[PDB]
């Protein structure tokens, strides 16, 4: 249907605000802590204290298959990433500092990306 398509577009082009997102958040991690997921041959009991590990890259590939339906879904996952550290990691460790500061950060992109969803509809 032609309705079909209509909303196709409107995904489409929500993947694309959604990864111009992505690319202005991933710039907050420099160190790359956030680029991909915890190893687990190198954190062997990781899933044991982190249910729903997520990571940069998890995010992309889910993006790039147009797996976030709104931004709230999007949102979610990058939450993850930063709840994840902060709970898996302790105060005084560059990892923690590091999501603290992503979090920070992320918050005024993330503002105005609500703005610009509601916006462009």
Do not use: W
């Not at 790039?64 to 902060?86: P, R, S, T, V």
């Amino acid at each position: 249907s032609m309705e079909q398509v209509a909303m196709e577009l409107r995904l489409t082009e929500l993947t694309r605000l959604l990864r111009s997102v992505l690319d202005q958040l991933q710039d907050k991690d420099p160190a790359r802590i956030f680029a991909q997921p915890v190893s687990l041959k190198e954190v062997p009991d990781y899933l044991d204290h982190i249910k729903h590990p997520m990571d940069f890259a998890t995010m992309r590939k889910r993006l790039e298959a147009q797996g976030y339906k709104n931004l709230h879904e999007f949102e979610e996952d990058f939450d993850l990433i930063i709840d994840n550290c902060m709970k898996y990691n302790a105060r005084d460790t560059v990892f923690y500092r590091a999501a603290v500061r992503l979090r920070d950060q992320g918050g005024v992109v993330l503002r105005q990306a609500r703005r610009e969803v509601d916006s462009i509809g």
